[PDB]
Amino acid sequence: VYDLSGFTVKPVATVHRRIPDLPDCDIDKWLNNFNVPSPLNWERKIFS
Amino acid sequence: SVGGLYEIKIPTNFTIVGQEEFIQTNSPKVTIDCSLFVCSNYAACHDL
Numbered sequence A: 001v002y003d004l005s006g007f008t009v010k011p012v013a014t015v016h017r018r019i020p021d022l023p024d025c026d027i028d029k030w031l032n033n034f035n036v037p038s039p040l041n042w043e044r045k046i047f048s
Numbered sequence B: 001s002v003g004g005l006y007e008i009k010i011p012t013n014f015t016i017v018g019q020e021e022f023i024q025t026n027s028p029k030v031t032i033d034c035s036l037f038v039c040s041n042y043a044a045c046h047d048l
């Protein structure tokens, strides 16, 4: 009697959930801002 | 021994007592799929 390698049931569908209608982060606009800070006063922006 | 006789307590009445004893002769037959335990469903883990 041979115990064969364990199988897992293959998924029959894919569930993808995202929050809709979220605005664009505009990361490029803040990175391309021409008022660039020095490392002494490095600037932070939080994208969420 | 008073003379040639010793003092002994000899039963004059009796009953029958029952005592249980469990002796383990078997244990659960644990089987491990080492591949499924170590790596679950992951091809990258099964390769390694």
Ligand SMILES: *[C@@H]1O[C@H](CO)[C@@H](O)[C@H](O)[C@H]1NC(C)=O
Pocket (backbone or CB within 6 Å): B012, B013, B014
């Ligand atoms: C033995 O003991 C039982 C219960 O203690 C009693 O009913 C019985 O009469 C006794 N027998 C004798 C011979 O002492």
